[PDB]
Structures are given as C-alpha cells and as structure tokens.
C-alpha cells in the first residue's frame, strides 16, 4: 500500500485534495471469507456504511444483497442494476413516501418495532413482508443502538398480534447488538432471544422463516473466527432447521479495509518540544469516527525514514476552525514537514459517507486500484 | 412565524424538512450592530452559515467577510464583493489556498506559527498579517484555545520572525471561543491584545488593526442585551481609544442564529409505558449537529393549534440508524401524530452548513420570507 500510494502521487504530481485509495479486490476476498466463515448466512450489505458506487457494484456482482435505510439508498442500489428483490428496507422507522416508493419499486421486506409503523404498512405497503426487530444489546459495542431501536421483550407478543390483526405477514426476527461489536456472547444471547420471539410469532399464527442477525462484526485480521464460530454455534443450537433462512446486515465487515485515506501536512507549529500538524482533512471530513467511535488512528508516513529515526510527540489537527477537530491528540511519529503525505489504513467504514463541507473543506478524490 | 410556516405548508402541499429564512431579521441585526459597536466593522464568519441570500444581504448592507478557505473566498467573490472586504481569518492555510487568495486579491490573513510565516514569505509575500493570540473564555460553548492562537511567551519571537522575513504585521486578533456569554473574557483579551500590539511596535511593525474575533450571541428579550457590548466598548476605550486604530470583529452566530427556523415532520411514533417517542425527517447528522457539538437541547413549536391540552413526556429522535442521533432526550409536549409539522426557532447558526447525507438522509428545502 505504501508503494501504491507513492506511485499515485508520482503519477499525479499536482494532487492537492486528500484522497481515498480503494480496492475492490480486498472486498471480493472478504466476501469469499464471509462465505467460509458464515456458510448459512446471506449478507445484506449495509449501504449506509459506505455507498461508494464501485463498492456497491462489487457487492452486486459477488451476489451480496443489500440493507437500505432510506429511499435514497434504495435508488443507489437500483441504479447499480440490483433487483429490488435483493433489498431489505432494514430501518424500523420509514417515511410514508419512502414506503410508497419501496412498494412501487419492489422493495417488500422491511423491519418494524412499533404499532404505528404497522399502521403505516397496512395503509401504504400492505403486502410488505415484515421482520420484527427486537432489542438485544452488546453493552461493550462501540456504538449503542438499543435505546432508539428494537422492541422490548414485554411488547413482542402484542406487536405480533397487532400485525396479525392488520393482515401483515411477519416473516422473521432481527436484532442489532450494536455497531462495532467484539462480544460473541452478545450474539449468542440475541439469537436465543430471537428463537423465543420466533416461537411467539408461530403462536400468534405467523409462519416466520428468517433470522436476521444484524451487523456489528469487524473483519479483524492478525482473519479471526472468534465471532463467527460462536454465532454459528448459536445458529446450530436455536435454528438448526434447513427451513430457516439466516441473513445479516454487515457494514463495517466489508467496508473497513476497502480504503485507505491519504492526507497532506499543510501547516505546522513546534512549541516546547511538541509537534503540531494541520492536515487537509478533518473530523468534519473523513474523520468523524474520532468523534463518534472514539477512534485514535495512527498514520503511515509515505516518506521513507531510517530505522533509527527519532520519534517526536505529535498532535494531528484537522483543517477546520473548531477546537473539537483533532484527528489524534497525542502520537509519537518521525518529524513531519509541510508537504509530507501520510495515509490512514482501513479507512473505509463510516468515513467518506459522513463528509461535510463545514468551513468550505471536505473535498476529496477517489482512486481505484 | 407560526402563521408564516403554516402558510408555506398550505402554499406547498412539501416532503423534506425546510428552513424558513428571513433577510429582514439580519438587516435589522446589522443596524443594531452599528449601534452596539459603533467603532467595530463586522467581518461575517461565512462558515457559520453560507446561504447565498444571507451573503448577498451582508454584501448589500456593507458588512465585510471572514473566509476560512478558498471555497469560502469563492462564495464571497462570486457575489460581487471586493476582495478588499475579505480577511482570510484562518491561521493555517494551505499553500494552494494562499496562491488562490493572492490571485483573488485577498491580501489580509491571520497567523500563529513561524511555519505559517514561511509559507506567506514564499507564496503571498505582500499579504498583511494579523497575529492571533490565545485568550480563552473558559465558559464558551466551543473551545478554540488548544488549537489556535499564539501563547504569550512566543508573541515577541513571532513578531521578530515576521520582521526578519519582511512581512508586514498590521494587527492583533483573538477568538475567546464560539458561543461566549462572558464579558470579562473579552476585556482581558483586548488588554492582552494591546500588550501584543505594543510588542509589535517595539519590534518595528506599524500595526493598526484590533480584531476581536467572534463568539457573541444576539440575545434578545424585542430588545438586544448590551451585557457584552458595553464591556467590550469599555475595554476598547481603556486600551485602544486612539482613532488611528481600526477595529474589526468576526461574528458568525450573532447574525446567523436568528436568520432561520427549521421545520420538520413527525414520520414515526412509538408509545411505550407513557413515554412518547417520535422520529423526525431530520437528524443530528442533518441540521441538528449542535445537539452534539454545542450541547443544544432544542424545544420545537407545534404548527397544529392546540387548546389551552395535556403535555406528555416526549423523546425526539433523528431519522438515522444511529443511537447517538437524538434531537431531544426529554421534552414535555402535547401529543404529536405522524404527519404533524413542528419548527425549531433560531436555527441558522452551524445548522445547514453541517449537513451530511449519512443514511441517505440530509436533504432539505429553503424558503425565503
Ligand atoms: C439496521 C442496521 N444494520 C446494519 C448496521 C451495520 O453496523 P456495522 O457495525 O457497520 O456492521 C447498522 C449500523 N447501525 C448504525 C451505526 C452508526 C455508526 N455511526 C458512526 N458515526 N460511525 C444498522 O443500523
Ligand atoms: C476565526 C473565527 N472567526 C469567527 C468565528 C465565529 O464564531 P461565532 O461564535 O459564530 O461568532 C470563528 C468560529 N470558531 C469555530 C466555530 C466552531 C463551531 N462548531 C460547531 N460544530 N458548531 C472563528 O474560528
């Protein structure tokens, strides 16, 4: 990667904007790994994590399906050439106009966690196949989702009965333990709770057949099987039947390693032995994960330094006016100079999708390799 | 405002959330600025709200501009504003933005580092420089001191370095922090600015500008409070009484805050054990980033008329799949229904400028009144 980025810089000597270097082949290999790690689980890629059109086309061609959060994401996927039959509208709160659009296009599998959402379905998309999302938290997940989404255990039966009353077909149960989960027991407990909800749905008179284990998984490479082995044990313990279809909604598993982000030192200040640098990127650009996921990322220098190069205490600032916009508060690095380029590895998940134009910055290029 | 917004809805039988923006309000505030600060020329901080009608209103009312980047300079230049009315008030500017500023005739900028002076000498040697010193309001909403502004112990060195490079230092600036209600902070900052001003004279510069930065609110109770302006003017009298000194400021929120209201619709609802949870077609990743970055706890105004009606405990959620995305965790309101519109007053400062398209949301309209 150090070589590739350096070659891009030499081939494009007038490069000024920060730039993503994205590799479809990385994602292809990871899709193949998913197939091996989770042989029973059909991935519905969470478009919200990274909606890069080459990434989505790569997914499409590898027979990966899609989790869309809005009508805009549905449109993106359809424009790639994917059948709307391959989309789960996996957001429990959908606008009436988005529901009408989904019905029209052929997106007819969606999630819910409220009676009012069932009312909307009844009126606007009456034959949409529904998946009840239940709350099952991983308390150690990086981004918590439980307060806002998912039915509590005590309303499961009521919601299923209400769906039955409105002639709404409930076809399965989903959960999301939280974004950025490394807790295998959380998935085990979630899958157990899902079987209990599945059994309530059957009791009410539904004929469910889908388990949706949501997202949260990292592709941790040292590729580790701690998460997958235990998830598969839970699938075996609670959903052994070949009549059940299992799906997932991974975002970061595929998107994380898709891209690196290259950025240039544009300003510098050295005070009492502390080396402060300003980059043509920011927490309002590609680095929102510093704010929302507590990321503390270390860059790779593109300039070669000797093995014995002295590291100095460094502060990596974003380019905006704001004091909150600090990429890394403290990191030991070789001394950098205005004009040096660095890159941040594994910068494809919840990075480019969260860009703003705050302060008039936020621009970037994308190179595919 | 309630009838105005209802009128827009009746006139546009409208799906997206929308800003209702009033140039008159800003024109009136400009007239008030001239009364509150008769000696201070405002350079509006474009970053706060870059709406084109707002910028044109500023232009026509003889207000100047504080631009943070080349993109922002472009926005101002393209509406016919003389480059002489722009200060490039960012202490860390890319070489290519300086090149651009030089091309456009933007010939005044701030700095707080020796490396910045190196860049100026090489790329914009005619640029007149304003030294930004660090002077904090510890009670300001958004702190800036950590990241920007020269420390007291380096002021003389920085001025001597500019002199060695044949760079003209024409003044001193500070920013106590964004969202300041501490008059003492400004008094001390202006006192410190006069000390720096005298150091500049001692070194051989001929400074003539004091730039008091931004931070101020237009706090109204239909009369604007002078709690800040009176003491700022007192400090000006004490430390910069000379008519040979030009005083400027870089206000953002003072003019932008009250420029707009943001209307948004209830798109989802869930009532659980007496708690009323609502989902809106807006989010903290759309126009409500101030909930995250400024710890805003905004209360909406209902557009539907209610009888002098029981209030219930309500939670206002944003439309994204993130658990962080909560507009207001707890607010007492009359019961709302899917389809109800509400609006949020004084929603013009750091609101529309910070929109993302995360989850495929973030779209909005703008109506001018
Ligand atoms: C329904 C659904 N499916 C799949 C995923 C996928 O989760 P992942 O960890 O990528 O596999 C998510 C992500 N939940 C909001 C995550 C916000 C993260 N916000 C942020 N600013 N980084 C989701 O809501
Ligand atoms: C040089 C300069 N001038 C004027 C202003 C104007 O400040 P105001 O309070 O609007 O008058 C600012 C705002 N400082 C970064 C503001 C980040 C706020 N961030 C956020 N997420 N809201 C600034 O940096």
**Inter-residue contact A18 to A285 (CB < 8 Å):** yes
Residue B1 inside a domain? The answer is no
Give B263: exposed, middle or buried? Use CB within 10 Å, 0-12, 13-18, 19+: buried
A190 and A172 share a domain? yes
Containing A185, the helix (H) or strand (E) segment is: helix A184-204
**Known catalytic membership, residue B127:** no
Q: Is residue A336 part of a domain?
A: yes
β-bridge mates for residue B306, sequence order: none
Same domain, B88 and B205: yes
How many beta-carbon contacts under 8 Å exist across A and B? 176
Integer angstrom CA distances of residue B322 from A48, B266, B326: 11, 18, 9
Do A66 and A189 lie in a common domain?
yes
Same domain, A202 and A334: no
Indicate which of A93, A266, A349, A353 best probes the interface with B, i.e. most B CBs within 10 Å of its own CB.
Answer: A93
Q: Hey, which residues 129-158 in chain B have their CB within 8 Å of chain A? A: 142-148, 151, 154
Deposited resolution, Å: 1.8
Q: Chain centroid to CA B57: how far?
A: 16
On whether residue A106 sits in a domain, the answer given is yes
A276 and A222 together in one domain: no
- Residues A181, A297 within the same domain: no
Q: Do A69 and B285 touch (CB under 8 A)?
A: no
Contact at 8 Å (CB) between B368 and B53?
yes
Residues A299, A237 within the same domain: no
Can you state the percent helix, strand and coil of chain B, rounding each to 5? 35, 25, 40
Supply the CATH number for residue A58's domain.
Answer: 3.20.20.10
Ligand 2-lining residues (CB < 6 angstroms): A 321-322; B 45, 48, 66, 89, 142, 144, 175, 178-179, 213-215, 250-254, 289-290, 293-294, 350
Which residue, chain included where needed, has tokens 């705050």? Answer: A358
- In whole angstroms, give the CA distance from residue B11 to residue B2: 14
Contact between B216 and B254 (Cβ < 8 Å)? yes
> Is A109 domain-assigned?
yes
- Locate the chain B residue with the closest alpha carbon to A74: B360
Task: Choose the final residue of a domain: B232, B255, B278.
Answer: B255
Is residue A135 located within the same domain as residue A262? no
Beta strands at B364-368 and B17-21: parallel, antiparallel or unpaired: parallel
C-alpha A249 to ligand 1 mean position (Å): 9
B205: tokens are 């510069």
Q: Do A271 and B68 touch (CB under 8 A)?
A: no
Boundary-marking domain end, from B255, B278, B308:
B255
Burial per residue of A347-360, b for 16 or more beta-carbon CB atoms within 10 angstroms, e otherwise:
bbbbbbbbbbbbbb
Whole-angstrom distance, CA of residue B93 vs CA of residue B111: 9
A138-160: b (≥16 Cβ within 10 Å) or e: beebbbbbbebbbbeeebbeebb
Residue A4 lies in a domain: no
Q: Contact, B325 vs B318, CB < 8 A?
A: yes
Three-state secondary structure readout of A76-125: HHHHHCCCHHHEEECCCCCCHHHHHHHHHHCCCEEEECCHHHHHHHHHHC
CA dist A342 and A231 (Å) reads 37
CB contact set of B250 (below 8 Å; sequence gap of 6+): B42, B43, B44, B45, B66, B87, B89, B173, B175, B211, B212, B213, B214
Write down the residue that tokens 């006192």 correspond to: B191
Give A5 to chain B, closest Cα distance, Å.
Answer: 21
- A47/B contact by beta carbon, under 8 A: yes
The reply to whether B176 and B301 lie within a common domain is no
The closest ligand to the CA of A323 turns out to be: 2
Q: How far is B210 from B338, CA to CA, in rounded Å?
A: 53
Q: B321 CA to middle of ligand 1, Å?
A: 7
Rounded to whole angstroms, the Cα distance separating B219 from B36 reads: 12
Q: How far is CA A139 from CA A136, A153, A180, A252, A294, in A?
A: 9, 17, 11, 19, 16
Q: Is B320 on the interface with A (CB under 8 A)?
A: yes
Same domain for A185 and A129 = yes
Write out residues with Cβ below 6 Å of ligand 1: A 46, 49, 67, 90, 143, 145, 176, 179-180, 214-217, 249-253, 288-289, 292-293, 350; B 321-322
* B90 part of contact set with chain A, CB < 8 Å: yes
Partners of A96 on chain B (C-beta within 8 Å) are 267, 338-339
Cβ distance B361 to A72 less than 8 Å, yes or no, reads yes
Closest CA to A270 of A323, A328, A336: A336
Q: Does the beta carbon of A317 lie under 8 angstroms from any beta carbon of chain B?
A: yes
Give the E-state strand segments of chain A in sequence order: 18-22, 41-46, 65-68, 87-89, 109-112, 129-133, 170-174, 210-212, 245-248, 259-271, 274-279, 300-301, 311-317, 326-334, 341-344, 364-368
In total, chain A counts a number of residues equal to 369
Q: How far apart are CA A174 and CA A216, in angstroms?
A: 13
Residue B12 CB neighbours (<10 A): 11
Cα gap A328→A317, rounded to integer Å: 7
Q: Which of residues 63-82 of A touch B (CB under 8 A)?
A: 68-73, 76
Strand partners, A247: A42, A212
Question: What count of Cα atoms within 13 Å lies in the side-chain half-sphere of residue A174?
Answer: 31
Q: What is the DSSP letter of A134?
A: B
Q: Which of A68, A128, A319, A321 is catalytic?
A: A321
Q: What residues are paired with A245 via a beta bridge?
A: A210
* A300 and A233 together in one domain: no
End of a domain among A238, A254, A270?
A254
Instruction: Mark B303-332 as b/e (b = at least 16 C-beta within 10 Å).
Output: beeeeeeeeeebbbbbbbbbbbbbbbeebe
Side-chain-facing half-sphere of A100: CA atoms under 13 Å: 4
Alpha-carbon distance values, B350 to A36, A326, B345 (Å): 47, 18, 14
From the CA of A349, the nearest ligand is 1
Per DSSP bridges, beta strands B246-249 and B40-45 are: parallel
Numbers of helices and strands, H then E, in chain A: 11, 16
Binding residues of B: 47, 175, 178-179, 215, 252-253, 350
Closest chain A residue to B178, measured at CA: A322
How far apart are the C-alpha atoms of A230 and A345, rounded to whole Å?
28
Residue A349 Cα: closest atom of ligand 1: 10
Q: Which residues of A touch B72 (CB under 8 A)?
A: 359-360
Domain that holds residue A85: 25-254
- Interface check for A123 against chain B (CB to CB < 8 A): the answer is no
Write the CATH number for A294: 2.40.37.10
Using CA atoms, how far residue A81 sits from A57, A59, A64, A353, in Å, is: 8, 11, 13, 21
Flag whether A3 is in a domain.
no
B26 and B259 Cβ atoms separated by less than 8 Å: yes
Which of B86, B173, B268, B284 has the highest number of chain A CBs within 10 A, making it the mutation to test binding with A?
A: B268
**B37 with B78, same domain?**
yes
Distance of residue A78 Cα from the nearest chain B Cα, in angstroms: 14
| Domain-located, residue A262 | yes
**How far, in Å, CA of B182 to CA of A344, rounded?**
40
Instruction: Name the token pair of A234.
Output: 């839970």
The 8-class DSSP code of residue A363 comes to -
Q: How many domains does chain A have?
A: 2
Alpha-carbon distance of A285 to A364, in angstroms, equals 9
DSSP string, B54-97: HHHHHHHTT-EEEE-SHHHHHHHHTTT--GGGEEE--SS--HHH
């Amino acid at each position: 990667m150090n070589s590739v980025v350096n070659n891009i810089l030499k081939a494009h000597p007038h490069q000024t904007k920060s730039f993503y270097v994205s590799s479809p082949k990385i994602v292809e290999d990871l899709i193949d790994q998913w197939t091996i790690l989770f042989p029973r689980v059909t991935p519905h890629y969470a478009v919200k994590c990274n909606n890069d059109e080459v990434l989505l086309k790569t997914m499409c061609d590898k027979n990966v399906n899609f989790d869309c959060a809005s009508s805009s994401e549905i449109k993106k996927v359809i424009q790639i050439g994917v059948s709307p039959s391959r989309i789960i509208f996996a957001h429990t709160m959908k606008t009436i106009d988005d529901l009408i659009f989904a019905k029209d296009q052929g997106v007819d599998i969606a999630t819910f966690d409220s009676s009012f959402e069932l009312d909307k379905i009844h009126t606007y998309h009456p034959n949409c196949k529904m998946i009840l999302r239940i709350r099952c938290d991983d308390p150690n997940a990086t981004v918590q989702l439980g307060n806002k989404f998912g039915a509590n255990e005590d309303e499961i039966r009521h919601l299923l009965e209400y769906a039955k009353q409105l002639d709404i077909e409930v076809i399965g149960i989903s959960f999301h333990v939280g974004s950025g989960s490394r807790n295998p027991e959380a998935y085990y407990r979630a899958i157990k709770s899902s079987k209990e909800a599945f059994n309530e749905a059957i009791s009410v008179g539904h004929k469910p057949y889908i388990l949706d284990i949501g997202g949260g998984l990292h592709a941790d490479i040292d590729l580790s099987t701690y998460m997958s082995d235990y998830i598969n044990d839970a699938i075996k313990d609670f959903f052994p039947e070949d009549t059940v279809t299992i799906v997932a909604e991974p975002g970061r598993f595929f998107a994380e390693h898709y891209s690196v982000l290259a950025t240039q030192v544009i300003g510098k200040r050295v005070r009492d032995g502390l080396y402060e640098y300003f980059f043509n990127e920011s927490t309002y650009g590609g680095f929102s994960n510093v704010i929302f996921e507590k990321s503390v990322p270390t860059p790779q220098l593109l300039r070669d330094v000797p093995d014995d190069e002295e590291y100095v205490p460094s502060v990596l600032y974003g380019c905006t006016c704001d004091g909150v916009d600090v990429i890394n508060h403290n990191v030991a690095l070789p001394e950098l100079h205005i004009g040096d380029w660095v890159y941040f590895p594994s910068w494809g998940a919840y990075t480019n999708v969260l860009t703003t134009s705050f302060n008039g910055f936020g621009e970037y290029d994308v190179y595919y390799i």
